[PDB]
Paper text:
We describe here the use of an artificial cofactor employing the well‐known biotin‐streptavidin system to catalyze a Baylis‐Hillman reaction. As protein host, we chose streptavidin, as it can be easily crystallized and thereby supports the design process. There are several examples using streptavidin as the host for these cofactors, since its natural ligand biotin binds strongly (K d∼10−15 M) and is easy to modify with catalysts at the carboxylic acid group. No enzyme is known to naturally catalyze the Baylis‐Hillman reaction, a very versatile and atom‐economic C−C bond forming reaction for the production of various functionalized compounds and intermediates of active pharmaceutical ingredients (APIs).
We chose a derivative of DMAP as the artificial cofactor due to its low steric demand, which will facilitate its inclusion into the protein scaffold. The protein host around the cofactor was rationally designed on the basis of high‐resolution crystal structures obtained after each variation of the amino acid sequence. The location of the catalyst is in a shallow cavity at the surface of the protein. The system was evolved through repeated cycles of mutagenesis, activity tests, and structure determination. According to the presented structures and calculations the catalytically active site is too shallow to undergo interactions with 1.
Residue numbers in the entry:
A (entry chain B), C (entry chain B): 14 to 134
B (entry chain A), D (entry chain A): 13 to 135
The structure:
Amino acid sequence: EAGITGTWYNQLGSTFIVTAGADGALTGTYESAAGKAESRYVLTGRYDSAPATDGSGTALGWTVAWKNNYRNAHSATTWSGQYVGGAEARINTQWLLTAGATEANGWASTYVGHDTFTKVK
Amino acid sequence: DEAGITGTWYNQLGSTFIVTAGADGALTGTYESAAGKAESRYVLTGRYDSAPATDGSGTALGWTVAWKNNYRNAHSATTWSGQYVGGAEARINTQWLLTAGATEANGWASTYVGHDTFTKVKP
Amino acid sequence: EAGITGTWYNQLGSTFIVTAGADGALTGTYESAAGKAESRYVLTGRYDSAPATDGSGTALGWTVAWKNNYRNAHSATTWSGQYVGGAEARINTQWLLTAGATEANGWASTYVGHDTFTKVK
Amino acid sequence: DEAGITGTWYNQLGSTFIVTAGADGALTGTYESAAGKAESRYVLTGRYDSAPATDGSGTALGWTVAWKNNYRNAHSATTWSGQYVGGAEARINTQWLLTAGATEANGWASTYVGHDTFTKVKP
Ligand SMILES: O=C(CCCC[C@@H]1SC[C@@H]2NC(=O)N[C@@H]21)NC1CCN(c2ccncc2)CC1
Ligand SMILES: O=C(CCCC[C@@H]1SC[C@@H]2NC(=O)N[C@@H]21)NC1CCN(c2ccncc2)CC1
Ligand SMILES: O=C(CCCC[C@@H]1SC[C@@H]2NC(=O)N[C@@H]21)NC1CCN(c2ccncc2)CC1
Ligand SMILES: O=C(CCCC[C@@H]1SC[C@@H]2NC(=O)N[C@@H]21)NC1CCN(c2ccncc2)CC1
């Protein structure tokens, strides 16, 4: 739980509050500073609870469906990446945002990007 | 769509995706990959839009598997991002990101991307 | 030049007319059945002119900037994939569409998708 | 932006991206990768928006490298998709797709995805 558990911020100022359970579980809340989002959204994910000891990062991923008590933007984002420990701990991710879409709009249903999370900002 | 998404799905690789869609918007179940450094079942967790649009749009969803179970650890995780489409054959169309634990020397090559489409029909 | 050179169609009905030069060059035109596009757009790309002989595909990629005489949608798409020969020849790709964007919109500037090209439809 | 995009660029890996932006919207030059199964320079070709927006938007562009030259063939190709931003430090922000020649058994693992950001300052 040690390294991952806590509050993280990405380059957009979004706020990633996560708890890494002993079984490999990620649970918490996400607050996006961008897009059709307000307040907190439930997140869930998984991480490698027994990572390699050769200096490589700890692989992980999590999902947010963009529905909460206030808004439903009919979309979901998954972050795929890894936690790296050290003087400047970091969660480096790439992400996919899929929106509900008709057949005619399916080609344009998915964003890709990359978020870097640190414990500052 | 609880009753629609809940069930056993298969992708074009023959992988098996056993999922339950709770009322809260949660996805829980197991994933068995027919490809790569995997064997037997792995825990998955995810989220879905529990109140989708009624205009004919699909139902957005995602889920994550960390490739560690009691038999194997491939020090990697895959996230699938996509949507459920109901109808004559319900389908789940995804794109996915597989990130492997990497060093600074290897980090540029840490992530695969691909696309899986799931149906309920056994291969 | 043999296998790749010709007219190809993807699952959206877009039309991919390409010539594969002996030096590894891809040149031709693209006509998209989707998005802010009309008529033909210039494409250029590269392919492995000496691929492996173990049965694997021939890696390739090409770019379209979405500006022609009629329209400019301030965006560019790159397809990355490979040509596979056989009874049903195929060009299997994934693609990235980046749109010109401000700092506030950068997070949402890029689509990802996948196109499969065959010599029918 | 012809004079802006034309020049020698470096990404966060130390790779060298020598490009000329023609008036037609074309990109031509050479790429030297600091990472992976590459050595010396490879041909690149691409396209860019020769008439970008004046609202503060970046200039969209893309280019392709096939990883074969006179010294090496890694049976793969990378496409970079991104945009040029001018200013105090001009920057080219990209995401990229590297596809390797694959078999049916290997096809699910054929494609890396990543992101490179280029400046003109030597590492
Ligand atoms: O804006 C949101 C939800 C908030 C997303 C926030 C994103 S998550 C990755 C990035 N990192 C963050 O921290 N924040 C941003 N959803 C819209 C997106 C645009 N939409 C479409 C529609 C059709 N096709 C494609 C896209 C409609 C739904
Ligand atoms: O093979 C697995 C675990 C099984 C994943 C199965 C994949 S999930 C998406 C697709 N859909 C499925 O149903 N099945 C496949 N994991 C890594 C280990 C090390 N790997 C890398 C890659 C890049 N850099 C470094 C190391 C390669 C793959
Ligand atoms: O529609 C086009 C150009 C035509 C693209 C056609 C695409 S190429 C991949 C797919 N395969 C095809 O055969 N056809 C489609 N460009 C728009 C896209 C939406 N735009 C934004 C703006 C801001 N952020 C993200 C996206 C504005 C520019
Ligand atoms: O290493 C290279 C050629 C050099 C590419 C350099 C890359 S371009 C994006 C990034 N930005 C840079 O500046 N440099 C790097 N090519 C393949 C060969 C076989 N590979 C696979 C992968 C997946 N499946 C099967 C085989 C791994 C990589």
